[PDB]
Amino acid sequence: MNGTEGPNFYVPFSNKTGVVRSPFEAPQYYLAEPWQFSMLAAYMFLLIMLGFPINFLTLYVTVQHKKLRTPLNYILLNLAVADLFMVFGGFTTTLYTSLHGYFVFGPTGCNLEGFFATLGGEIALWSLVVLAIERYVVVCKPMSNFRFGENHAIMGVAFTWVMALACAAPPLVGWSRYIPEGMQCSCGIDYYTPHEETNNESFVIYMFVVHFIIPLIVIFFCYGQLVFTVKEAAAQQQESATTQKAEKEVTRMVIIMVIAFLICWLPYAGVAFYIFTHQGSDFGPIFMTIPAFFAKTSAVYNPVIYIMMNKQFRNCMVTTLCCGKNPLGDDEASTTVSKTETSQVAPA
Amino acid sequence: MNGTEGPNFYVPFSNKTGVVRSPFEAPQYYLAEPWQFSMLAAYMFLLIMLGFPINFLTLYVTVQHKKLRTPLNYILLNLAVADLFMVFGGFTTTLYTSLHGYFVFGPTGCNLEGFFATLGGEIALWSLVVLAIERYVVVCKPMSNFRFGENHAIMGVAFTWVMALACAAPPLVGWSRYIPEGMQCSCGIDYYTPHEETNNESFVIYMFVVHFIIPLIVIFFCYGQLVFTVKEAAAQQQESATTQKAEKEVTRMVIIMVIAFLICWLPYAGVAFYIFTHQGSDFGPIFMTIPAFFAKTSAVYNPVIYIMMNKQFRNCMVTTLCCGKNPLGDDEASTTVSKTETSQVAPA
Ligand SMILES: *[C@@H]1O[C@H](CO)[C@@H](O[C@@H]2O[C@H](CO)[C@@H](O[C@@H]3O[C@H](CO)[C@@H](O)[C@H](O[C@@H]4O[C@H](CO)[C@@H](O)[C@H](O)[C@@H]4O)[C@@H]3O)[C@H](O)[C@H]2NC(C)=O)[C@H](O)[C@H]1NC(C)=O
Ligand SMILES: *[C@@H]1O[C@H](CO)[C@@H](O[C@@H]2O[C@H](CO)[C@@H](O[C@H]3O[C@H](CO)[C@@H](O)[C@H](O)[C@@H]3O)[C@H](O)[C@H]2NC(C)=O)[C@H](O)[C@H]1NC(C)=O
Ligand SMILES: *[C@@H]1O[C@H](CO)[C@@H](O[C@@H]2O[C@H](CO)[C@@H](O)[C@H](O)[C@H]2NC(C)=O)[C@H](O)[C@H]1NC(C)=O
Ligand SMILES: *[C@@H]1O[C@H](CO)[C@@H](O[C@@H]2O[C@H](CO)[C@@H](O)[C@H](O)[C@H]2NC(C)=O)[C@H](O)[C@H]1NC(C)=O
Ligand SMILES: *C/C=C(C)/C=C/C=C(C)\C=C\C1=C(C)CCCC1(C)C
Ligand SMILES: *C/C=C(C)/C=C/C=C(C)\C=C\C1=C(C)CCCC1(C)C
Ligand SMILES: CCCCCCCS[C@@H]1O[C@H](CO)[C@@H](O)[C@H](O)[C@H]1O
Ligand SMILES: CCCCCCCS[C@@H]1O[C@H](CO)[C@@H](O)[C@H](O)[C@H]1O
Ligand SMILES: CCCCCCCS[C@@H]1O[C@H](CO)[C@@H](O)[C@H](O)[C@H]1O
Ligand SMILES: CCCCCCCS[C@@H]1O[C@H](CO)[C@@H](O)[C@H](O)[C@H]1O
Ligand SMILES: *C(=O)CCCCCCCCCCCCCCC
Ligand SMILES: *C(=O)CCCCCCCCCCCCCCC
Ligand SMILES: *C(=O)CCCCCCCCCCCCCCC
Ligand SMILES: *C(=O)CCCCCCCCCCCCCCC
Ligand SMILES: [Hg+2]
Ligand SMILES: [Hg+2]
Ligand SMILES: [Hg+2]
Ligand SMILES: [Hg+2]
Ligand SMILES: [Hg+2]
Ligand SMILES: [Hg+2]
Ligand SMILES: [Zn+2]
Ligand SMILES: [Zn+2]
Ligand SMILES: [Zn+2]
Ligand SMILES: [Zn+2]
Ligand SMILES: [Zn+2]
Ligand SMILES: [Zn+2]
Ligand SMILES: [Zn+2]
Secondary structure: OOOEEOOOOEEOOOOOOOOOOOOOOOOOOOOOOHHHHHHHHHHHHHHHHHHHHHHHHHHHHHHHOOOOOOHHHHHHHHHHHHHHHHHHHHHHHHHHHHHHOOOOOHHHHHHHHHHHHHHHHHHHHHHHHHHHHHHHHHHOOOOOOOOOOHHHHHHHHHHHHHHHHHHHOHHHOOOOOEEEEOOOOEEEEOOOOOOHHHOHHHHHHHHHHHHHHHHHHHHHHHHHHOOOOOOOOOOOOOOOOHHHHHHHHHHHHHHHHHHHHHHHHHHHHHHHHHHHOOOOOOOOHHHHHHHHHHHHHHHOHHHHHHHHOOHHHHHHHHHHHOOOOOOOOOOOOOOOOOOOOOOOOOOO | OOOEEOOOOEEOOOOOOOOOOOOOOOOOOOOOOHHHHHHHHHHHHHHHHHHHHHHHHHHHHHHHOOOOOOHHHHHHHHHHHHHHHHHHHHHHHHHHHHHHOOOOOHHHHHHHHHHHHHHHHHHHHHHHHHHHHHHHHHHOOOOOOOOOOHHHHHHHHHHHHHHHHHHHOHHHOOOOOEEEEOOOOEEEEOOOOOOHHHOHHHHHHHHHHHHHHHHHHHHHHHHHHOOOOOOOOOOOOOOOOHHHHHHHHHHHHHHHHHHHHHHHHHHHHHHHHHHHOOOOOOOOHHHHHHHHHHHHHHHHHHHHHHHHHOHHHHHHHHHHHOOOOOOOOOOOOOOOOOOOOOOOOOOO
8 A cells, every 4th residue: 555544544654664653643753854844843833923923913903993894804804813713723733743743632633733724724715705795896886885884794704604614613523534644743634535434525525616616716707807897907096086096905905815825725725636536646745745834824924915905904003013103104095093093983 | 327326326227218216205116016015015024023023032031041141042142132123123114115115214214224234134243253262162172271151252242243333333424325225125335336425435345354254264264173073973962971962062053053144145245246346237126135135034044043953942942931831842951940940050
């Protein structure tokens, strides 16, 4: 056999030399140099040290500034929360695991690592549809007088979690399972074994369809609509109203946010689909480690896009960080937002 | 003319089309795509969001743990502090500047961005000599009963800032000057123009010798001395004493620290030396941008080497992060301590 299937796992290493051991019982240093595990460990350490502050800081700003309540502000507040979950929820285990070379917490550690990474990713993917829709509603404006309220945003948010819980919780209760991958320091869905006892093959299809191909079709199709109407071609002050101009900024970011999701997940999903369609073939530990641990950056790239592609949000942050206020930058040249300062309501 | 010299700058772009404008007065979007400035803008954001926690942590752990007071301990606290300066002193403006496309804060910002970036870089170069010496004094011990104590370290520390300020301060008071480089989003020493009115051509030769060639000669030399004695080969617990085998690791770190320094600064120094000897020649904005924004990682690669190459520091760190004790691991093995818990001394 090309690999060592265990009842709980599937090590991508032949056991001809009988040197293969359960990644829930002993170091996997026989799969790769030990330094490389340190590598992974130093990596998760840095990601945690970047992901915590960047996502908490986002969370804290969105709240503090009572005027940041656009559907986007809700969605990115939702992501920052999911990213904190990814950090303490699973990165903490994936760091611990890397340090020891194996899932010392056994299948639990594997479930924590895998669950939160999946939850993290699906919430992102599903938050992208909500943005794709919202963006469609304000650019191709399906209604004549429709305007999303905080209520609607709270809907989109609750939605992304129902969807995300949908494919990330089942593997905890019998439908498929989380199993170590690559060097065995991370956990993903089971694409490796057919394990009928838990219906692995049906769950992988369901997942690749309902939680990948469909959300992308929607996301890509919607874009084919905001091709004729609002286009990346953005100018200076006003564009058909400074309001229209600023509507163009949010869309650029939402597009960029997609490219960012794709870069971060196609490589993982790709290798995932490959194996699924080549179970038992001869692949090794590094095959899925690289995409797997690269995708963990998904826990931080969103807030950074937000802060670099949103004049408003960026300033509230400076306003927050500079304790008092004095939001240098260049403001939004438009509305602002905060708590005691200029969070003054400015309607009609 | 290949570039556009202003009385204050030197944009590496022709003004044949008359689209060139002072990097102190308007976006340089005509030098490179605006998405590229956002890319730099992001990059600095991450550096700031990583270099801050990691350097503050290094600082806080050293201070808090009493046994952490060897010469090395002294130096890397220095770095952690020089790094904190690079981040808040200069990175902050380079971030703001990149977000805007030019130095909205004019030459003050150029001086801020440039000064601190040099201060940091030079402090790190001199501290590599201090280490070079200390390493020599302990491996080729040309002394009889001379111990390189804290008093010496606090010396070699003040020393480094006296040298660093030596080349980092003059451009602020008439000798040479700081000026935008590459995409005009970071500042450096004037290698581009002769500006006799400020003696650029002399300050550069001074610098490339007093604060580059010399230090490197000494450091590369002190590496020659410890060629016969301590080497790269270091067995397990002990080699001629575990104390003799424990010093061979601080040496292997000091060497890695230098390798890292060279990778971070040779490219830049090189590009800089090339331009100084090809002023007016036809180079573009990306030419200096790539090496220039890469040497900025200088603000964070040190605390990383340290946490991965110094068992003692590492363990003391985890102790601090695990609040109380929970040293878990396998303890330093030799010495340990903290703020109070294991702070218990056992010297001589
Ligand atoms: C590259 O080649 C360009 C084409 O020849 C050349 O264009 C000249 O650019 C300057 C500015 O860079 C123009 O002069 C400005 O004119 C405006 C009037 O619209 C003034 O407002 C401005 O001065 C003001 O001064 C105020 C007080 O100091 C200050 O508050 C304002 O902000 C502002 O600075 C300038 O006088 C000039 O008209 C342009 N000439 C032509 C024919 O277009 C570029 O200068 C040149 N770029 C280089 C060499 O860097
Ligand atoms: C790869 O081949 C290895 C050699 O055949 C094989 O090692 C075997 O590991 C089991 C662990 O389950 C050992 O069995 C021991 O199990 C418990 C210990 O927890 C106790 O009942 C006894 O100590 C018992 O011996 C086998 O002894 C050992 N066989 C050997 C080395 O001869 C691995 O299990 C294989 N890896 C796979 C397929 O997962
Ligand atoms: C073990 O791995 C090898 C290589 O991945 C597999 O060999 C391939 O087998 C398929 C048929 O299943 C052929 O189409 C390929 O041409 C073979 N490639 C090579 C390099 O021989 C082998 O099938 C695997 N063993 C199993 C089934 O577990
Ligand atoms: C403008 O830049 C060009 C390119 O760097 C310079 O042209 C070079 O000039 C040197 C000396 O005059 C020659 O040895 C090279 O062969 C030239 N490069 C080539 C092959 O084109 C030019 O000197 C610069 N001129 C200005 C305005 O300073
Ligand atoms: C390090 C841990 C990782 C990368 C675990 C991920 C698990 C998992 C099942 C992820 C699935 C997917 C996404 C999230 C994004 C869309 C594509 C999927 C279905 C491959
Ligand atoms: C982003 C800011 C940068 C790269 C500024 C650097 C400024 C400067 C004058 C640096 C000089 C040097 C060092 C520091 C290291 C050794 C080599 C020098 C002399 C090129
Ligand atoms: C970026 C998307 C990546 C898509 C996944 C392509 C996997 S490709 C796969 O890799 C194996 C590694 O052992 C090779 O042995 C095999 O020949 C090759 O076809
Ligand atoms: C965090 C990575 C972001 C880098 C990707 C930039 C994509 S695009 C970039 O976005 C800026 C902010 O809205 C705009 O001002 C600018 O005009 C636009 O070209
Ligand atoms: C170790 C890194 C040192 C880098 C110094 C090499 C500079 S190389 C120099 O660059 C000019 C501008 O692009 C070109 O026009 C020219 O042809 C090329 O030789
Ligand atoms: C929480 C901060 C993360 C830094 C990681 C510290 C790894 S520390 C490492 O751990 C090994 C076994 O667990 C011990 O045997 C060894 O002595 C210890 O230095
Ligand atoms: C409210 O306005 C406080 C601002 C919050 C940002 C943090 C600013 C830190 C100040 C820089 C510290 C200099 C480093 C010194 C190291 C010894
Ligand atoms: C205003 O005073 C100038 C802005 C200075 C801000 C410096 C940026 C440092 C970012 C650190 C924030 C970390 C967030 C902490 C989360 C717990
Ligand atoms: C001990 O109690 C185990 C818990 C330690 C925390 C988990 C490791 C996270 C990586 C460190 C990043 C912390 C960021 C704050 C730096 C000042
Ligand atoms: C002092 O000992 C405290 C160290 C910091 C605690 C970090 C320990 C990691 C535990 C996992 C995080 C809990 C899940 C929360 C998800 C939001
Ligand atoms: Hg869309
Ligand atoms: Hg990514
Ligand atoms: Hg704001
Ligand atoms: Hg030396
Ligand atoms: Hg470097
Ligand atoms: Hg300690
Ligand atoms: Zn089973
Ligand atoms: Zn889902
Ligand atoms: Zn199958
Ligand atoms: Zn601004
Ligand atoms: Zn002058
Ligand atoms: Zn100097
Ligand atoms: Zn010259």
